[PDB]
Design an enzyme around this catalytic site. Structure first.
Site, short mmCIF file in Angstrom:
data_model
loop_
_atom_site.label_atom_id
_atom_site.label_comp_id
_atom_site.label_asym_id
_atom_site.label_seq_id
_atom_site.Cartn_x
_atom_site.Cartn_y
_atom_site.Cartn_z
N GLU A 65 0.86 -1.21 0.00
CA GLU A 65 0.00 0.00 0.00
C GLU A 65 0.89 1.25 0.00
O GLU A 65 0.99 1.93 1.05
CB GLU A 65 -0.97 -0.06 1.19
CG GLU A 65 -2.24 -0.85 0.89
CD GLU A 65 -3.09 -1.33 2.06
OE1 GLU A 65 -2.74 -1.05 3.24
OE2 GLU A 65 -4.08 -2.03 1.79
N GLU A 74 -5.40 -8.38 -1.18
CA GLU A 74 -6.23 -8.26 0.05
C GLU A 74 -7.70 -8.04 -0.32
O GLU A 74 -7.99 -7.29 -1.28
CB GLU A 74 -5.79 -7.08 0.93
CG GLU A 74 -4.45 -7.30 1.63
CD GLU A 74 -3.96 -6.10 2.43
OE1 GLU A 74 -4.82 -5.28 2.89
OE2 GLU A 74 -2.72 -5.99 2.61
#
Length: 305
Positions: free
Chosen positions: A133, A240
């Site tokens: 991220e 995810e």
């Protein structure tokens, strides 16, 4: 049989108490539990994203040496996984940041990778994830950090392993064309690149909620990212994802996952967030025996295995 190439779960604990570097093992953090992974292999799960910290792994400088203990702890979990012929995603879960500072040096970041990847070059089953991220950084720096990672990886002799790349704005699938258009340009001598994206189904896509927008928001939030991979001839994996333990969320997880399977020409797989020992009463816990997403989603996910 198999709707995707891969399907598994994140296995968290080694990236916990990130407010504590190095932090004490068993108090601030812990490694996944191999018995429970096994419970999720018996079940049909054949890829596992195991997060860690860059700070605990190679302290002080990302040009530095490995912490024997923490890496001995970490490799033990990666080796069990592959040991049973399942794919093991090495996830420096650090958000583009080293000790709070956005990583900017491509040289140090490749010297970080070459040092980590070195330890795994002859393990066919390991997959490298450049960082978790990238957010609130410049696109150019992110592309170049994804490019450096690849280089330190291959340059150390890990030419057999898939490299998972990650966008800016938290590498999210709904915002992939808004921001990550430029990730196109990254290159691999082994040509084993996959664009790992995350997708959550709450208002803001943070994950933090067990309420979904709608029962359709899933399939909605991954059309743009899909056409992108089809059009530019790329492979991606939803690294995810999760839903809350309620109909609407499930409905949207099934609908999102349908669309990905109908598009398996570009979507290689997915992995629930998250399995792992210390989740406890977590909205999204896939850890058995009593993890909420375990009791809720496991029967749904093993429909695509």
């Amino acid at each position: 049989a198999s709707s995707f190439e891969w399907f598994g779960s994140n296995e968290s604990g080694a990236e916990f108490g990130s407010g504590n570097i190095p932090g004490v093992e068993g108090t601030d953090y812990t490694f996944p539990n191999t018995t429970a992974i096994q419970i999720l292999i018996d079940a049909g799960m054949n890829i596992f994203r195991v997060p860690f910290l860059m700070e605990r792994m190679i302290p002080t400088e990302m040009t530095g040496s490995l912490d024997t203990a923490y890496f001995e702890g970490y490799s033990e979990v990666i080796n069990y996984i592959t040991g049973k012929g399942a794919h093991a995603v090495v996830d420096p879960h650090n958000f583009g940041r080293y000790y709070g500072t956005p990583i900017s040096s491509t040289s140090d970041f490749q010297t970080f990778w070459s040092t980590l990847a070195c330890q795994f070059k002859s393990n066919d089953l390991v997959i490298f994830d450049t960082n978790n991220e990238y957010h609130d950084m410049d696109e150019s720096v992110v592309v170049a950090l994804n490019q450096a990672a690849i280089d330190g990886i291959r340059d150390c002799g890990a030419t057999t392993q898939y490299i998972f790349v990650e966008g800016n704005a938290y590498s999210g699938a709904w915002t992939w064309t808004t921001y990550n258009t430029a990730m196109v340009n990254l290159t691999d001598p082994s040509d084993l690149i996959v664009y790992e994206m995350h997708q959550y189904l709450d208002s803001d896509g943070s994950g933090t909620s067990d309420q979904c927008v709608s029962s359709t928001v899933g399939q909605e939030r991954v059309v743009d990212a899909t056409t992108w991979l089809q059009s530019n001839g790329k492979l991606g994996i939803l690294g995810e994802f999760a839903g809350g333990a309620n109909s609407v969320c499930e409905e949207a997880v099934e609908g999102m996952l349908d669309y990905l399977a109908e598009n398996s020409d570009v979507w290689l797989g997915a992995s629930w967030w998250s399995a792992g020992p210390w989740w406890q009463d977590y909205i999204y816990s896939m850890e058995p025996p009593n993890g909420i997403a375990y009791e809720s989603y496991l029967s749904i996910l093993e429909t695509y295995f």
